Amino acid sequence: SKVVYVSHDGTRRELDVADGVSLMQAAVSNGIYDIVGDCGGSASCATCHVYVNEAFTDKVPAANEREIGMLESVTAELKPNSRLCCQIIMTPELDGIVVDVPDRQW
Amino acid sequence: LAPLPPHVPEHLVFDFDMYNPSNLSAGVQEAWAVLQESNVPDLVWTRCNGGHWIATRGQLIREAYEDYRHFSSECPFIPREAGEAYDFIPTSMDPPEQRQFRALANQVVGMPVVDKLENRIQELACSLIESLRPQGQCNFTEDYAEPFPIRIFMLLAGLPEEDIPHLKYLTDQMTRPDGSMTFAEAKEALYDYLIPIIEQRRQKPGTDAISIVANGQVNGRPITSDEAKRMCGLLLVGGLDTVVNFLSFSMEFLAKSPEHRQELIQRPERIPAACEELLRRFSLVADGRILTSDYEFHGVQLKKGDQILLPQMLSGLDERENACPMHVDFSRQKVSHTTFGHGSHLCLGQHLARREIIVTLKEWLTRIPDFSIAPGAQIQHKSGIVSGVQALPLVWDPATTKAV
Numbered sequence: 001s002k003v004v005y006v007s008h009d010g011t012r013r014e015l016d017v018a019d020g021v022s023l024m025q026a027a028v029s030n031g032i033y034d035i036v037g038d039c040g041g042s043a044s045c046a047t048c049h050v051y052v053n054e055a056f057t058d059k060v061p062a063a064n065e066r067e068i069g070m071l072e073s074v075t076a077e078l079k080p081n082s083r084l085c086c087q088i089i090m091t092p093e094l095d096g097i098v099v100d101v102p103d104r105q106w
Numbered sequence: 107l108a109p110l111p112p113h114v115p116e117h118l119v120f121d122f123d124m125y126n127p128s129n130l131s132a133g134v135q136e137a138w139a140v141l142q143e144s145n146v147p148d149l150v151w152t153r154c155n156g157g158h159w160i161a162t163r164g165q166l167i168r169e170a171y172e173d174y175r176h177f178s179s180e181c182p183f184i185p186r187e188a189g190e191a192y193d194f195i196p197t198s199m200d201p202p203e204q205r206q207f208r209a210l211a212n213q214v215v216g217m218p219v220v221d222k223l224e225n226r227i228q229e230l231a232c233s234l235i236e237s238l239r240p241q242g243q244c245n246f247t248e249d250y251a252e253p254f255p256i257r258i259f260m261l262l263a264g265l266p267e268e269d270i271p272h273l274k275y276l277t278d279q280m281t282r283p284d285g286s287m288t289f290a291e292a293k294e295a296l297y298d299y300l301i302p303i304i305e306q307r308r309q310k311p312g313t314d315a316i317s318i319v320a321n322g323q324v325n326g327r328p329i330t331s332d333e334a335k336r337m338c339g340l341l342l343v344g345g346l347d348t349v350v351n352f353l354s355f356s357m358e359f360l361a362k363s364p365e366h367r368q369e370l371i372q373r374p375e376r377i378p379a380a381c382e383e384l385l386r387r388f389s390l391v392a393d394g395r396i397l398t399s400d401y402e403f404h405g406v407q408l409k410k411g412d413q414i415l416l417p418q419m420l421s422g423l424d425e426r427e428n429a430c431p432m433h434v435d436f437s438r439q440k441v442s443h444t445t446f447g448h449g450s451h452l453c454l455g456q457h458l459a460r461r462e463i464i465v466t467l468k469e470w471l472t473r474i475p476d477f478s479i480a481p482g483a484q485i486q487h488k489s490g491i492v493s494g495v496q497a498l499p500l501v502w503d504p505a506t507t508k509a510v
């Protein structure tokens with residue numbers, strides 16, 4: 001399914017992610033900008049922070065207790081559509097989802 | 107054996123020695139797996155090495171590494187004295203604070219440095235293997251497992267290769283001590299080597315990893331010479347005693363299984379899936395935490411100050427996590443393991459490790475597709491914070507190899 005990553009400078013990158021893959025693994029595996037994914041995707045860090053496009057936020061299953069806690073420490077501005085992309089598993093219902101990546105993760 | 111403490115019940119005692127397990131001759135992963143036999147409880151107490159708890163199942167090991175409020179990383183090694191002397195810097199800390207040091211360490215061993223070293227890692231792997239190809243034999247631990255990943259780290263840290271046998275000795279006393287040095291003496295000797303190099307690189311900062319850590323910032327402020335020394339010490343041990351040991355466990359298995367060698371030669375794009383399955387079957391790290399207060403965990407009462415060894419190698423070997431855990435299946439659908447750690451201390455150099463493992467398997471099978479253990483040789487392993495292989499003599503017909 002298609003997933004678009006817009007960077008801080010305004011660059012756009014489109015990937016074809018299969019089902020079961022988290023947006024963090026797809027971004028790190030394709031050298032996408034700024035996303036680090038240091039903890040490995042276990043919601044124990046905040047370097048995979050992204051802003052899900054307002055039109056897809058209700059198509060993704062909300063953050064759990066661990067992600068809400070880690071989102072309280074993101075270095076970039078915290079928006080109401082902010083999510084640790086390692087928690088978003090790709091499905092064909094999210095085809096075309098767009099997420100903006102903040103240039104500050106650490 | 108240390109005298110059983112009065113809050114530990116007699117029925118939870120299992121004297122397992124992590125530096126010299128009783129079944130080490132059958133394989134160190136097999137030696138640690140005796141803790142998972144039907145008759146052993148999920149959490150036991152061993153009177154060996156001063157006395158400490160051991161979580162034997164993945165559920166308990168993952169849960170303890172997630173809860174840093176009860177299990178602290180302040181004292182993580184197991185002669186109660188090595189854990190107290192341990193003070194490297196994204197590990198001896200609990201995470202409000204520990205988090206700011208992980209970003210600086212990521213700058214020197216994370217993906218951004220793997221991309222800077224991509225060409226040199228591929229060139230050294232091909233050069234070391236092509237030089238061995240026509241010999242038809244080699245001592246894998248000294249001819250490749252040590253020089254490949256240690257020379258790349260010395261290049262990444264800007265240190266001269268002539269210092270490898272002094273550093274490799276200090277790092278090995280902190281994981282598998284032979285008795286000549288305590289953990290504190292080896293750690294202070296490693297700091298003694300880094301102190302004058304960190305001050306020189308703070309005056310003239312260059313491009314190597316020690317210059318970046320010594321002149322780096324943590325959450326907007328500049329790191330102190332002491333913090334840089336405690337972080338550089340951890341990078342040296344991780345660069346000289348982790349992939350070096352895992353490469354030998356993996357090559358020993360491939361040498362003893364020609365069906366697995368054929369699977370990767372026929373389909374080389376399965377090597378990074380095979381690398382993960384080998385990381386699970388041949389996991390080799392086992393440190394732990396200390397209780398911050400009295401706490402009942404899975405029906406057992408732990409006391410403040412108690413040390414509990416949460417061995418990362420046991421989670422992937424647990425049958426409750428993977429069926430037929432001792433069998434290596436490159437196609438295993440769910441390869442679950444904590445080989446690179448679990449919780450907020452996840453390995454920061456796992457990307458450099460995966461790259462060195464995958465480049466070694468692909469470039470070795472391309473030049474030397476068929477090889478076996480030297481005839482008559484019985485491979486011996488060693489245990490400690492990081493397990494390893496004492497020696498791995500391999501042989502092959504140089505008429506079946508091919509120069510690229």
Ligand code: HEM
Pocket residue numbers: 179182195196197198204208211215340341342343344345348349352390391393394418444445446447448450451452453454455456458459
């Ligand atoms: C097969 C190779 C490797 C294995 C199995 C491995 C395993 C581990 C484990 C289990 C931990 C967590 C320890 C704890 O929670 O107490 C860890 C942490 C760490 N490793 Fe790796 N490691 C490997 C390679 C490397 C390399 C090559 C480096 C480069 C220096 C490295 C650097 C680190 C660092 C800096 C940490 C600390 C993270 C923190 O405490 O926040 N490791 N490693």
Ligand SMILES: CC1(C)[C@@H]2CC[C@@]1(C)C(=O)C2
Pocket residue numbers: 194197281340343344348391392393491492
């Ligand atoms: C347990 C480890 C492998 C992890 C990195 C090196 C090591 C020995 C440490 O002291 C932390």
Ligand code: FES
Pocket residue numbers: 024036037038039040041042043044045046047048070084085086087
């Ligand atoms: S990669 Fe750590 S929280 Fe997403």
